[PDB]
């Protein structure tokens, strides 16, 4: 036999251990349209109908975005857009209200509630109206049979909607 001394410079005393990390995917959509009717005299929404081009998703990552279009997510070939249609606005006060509407994702429809929070009602520089409001609320993937193949473990059953809107009077 024979004795050796490590060469610390070309020796690695190494280990690998697997762990999980929870993180939020944040995303918007670049391309959508809305029809907004609002009465600044009473701080009530009268009609709110949004259509979102699924195609235009942006989670700040190209490969995931493309993946979102596929059969196991949006199926944008078949169902190119998601729609929201307001059915009812219940004023709480001038800053706050409960908004009820029909959300349609990949052809499945469910009535959801969003929390309307009016961040500002104004008359502009030019004497024409402005508003700034937010719509917030949790929807469940399962309620829309959305991404059924993906486990509620890997990806949460809960999506959190945060629609932040600035908007000016028409014509």
Site string for a second copy, 36-75 (x = CB under 8 A): xxxxx---x-x---x-x-----------------------
Spacing of C-alpha 80 from chain mean position: 16
Give the span between the Cα atoms of 47 and 37, in whole angstroms.
Answer: 5
Question: In the structure encoding, which two tokens stand for residue 49, read together?
Answer: 């109908």
Q: Does 158 bind a second copy (CB under 8 A)?
A: yes
At closest approach, how far in Å is the CB of 126 from a second copy? Answer: 14
Pairing outcome for strands 32-39 and 44-53:
antiparallel
Is the separation of the CB atoms in 94 and 134 below 8 Å?
no
At closest approach, how far in Å is the CB of 153 from ligand LFA? Answer: 10
Helix or strand run (H / E) with residue 32: strand 32-39
Q: Which of 26, 77, 123, 145 contacts a second copy by CB under 8 A?
A: 26
Q: Which of 55, 95, 143, 165 contacts a second copy by CB under 8 A?
A: 165
Pick the stretch among 12-20, 38-46, 87-95, 120-128 that binds ligand LFA (CB under 6 A).
Answer: 12-20
Is the separation of the CB atoms in 108 and 97 below 8 Å?
no
At closest approach, how far in Å is the CB of 8 from ligand LFA? Answer: 15
At closest approach, how far in Å is the CB of 159 from ligand LFA? Answer: 5
Q: Which of 5, 63, 125, 126 contacts a second copy by CB under 8 A?
A: 5
Angle at 63 between CA 62 and CA 69, to 5 degrees: 95
Give the span between the Cα atoms of 6 and 120, in whole angstroms.
Answer: 70
99 binds, among ligand LFA, a second copy, none (CB under 5 to 8 A by kind): none
Q: Does 19 bind ligand LFA (CB under 6 A)?
A: yes
Long-range contacts of 119-125 (CB under 8 A, 24+ apart): 121/40, 121/43, 121/94, 124/168, 124/169
Residues that bind ligand LFA (CB under 6 A): 13, 15, 17, 19, 25, 50, 52, 64, 84, 155, 159, 161, 163
């Amino acid at each position: 036999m024979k004795e050796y001394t490590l060469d610390k410079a070309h020796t690695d005393v190494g280990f690998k251990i697997k762990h999980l990390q929870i993180s939020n995917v944040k995303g918007n959509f670049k391309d959508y349209s809305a029809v907004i009717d609002f009465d600044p005299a009473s701080a009530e929404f009268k009609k709110l109908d949004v259509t979102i081009k699924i195609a235009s998703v942006n989670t700040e990552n190209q490969t995931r975005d493309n993946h979102l279009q596929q059969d196991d997510f949006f199926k944008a070939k078949k169902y190119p857009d998601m729609t929201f249609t307001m059915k009812k606005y219940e004023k709480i006060d001038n800053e706050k209200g409960k908004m009820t509407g029909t959300l349609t994702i990949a052809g499945v429809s469910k009535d959801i509630v969003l929390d309307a929070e009016i961040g500002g009602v104004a008359k502009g520089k030019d004497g024409k109206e402005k508003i700034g409001f937010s719509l917030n609320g949790k929807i469940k993937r399962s309620d829309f049979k959305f991404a059924t193949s993906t486990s509620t473990i890997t990806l949460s059953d809960d999506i959190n909607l945060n629609i932040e809107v600035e908007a000016n009077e028409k014509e």
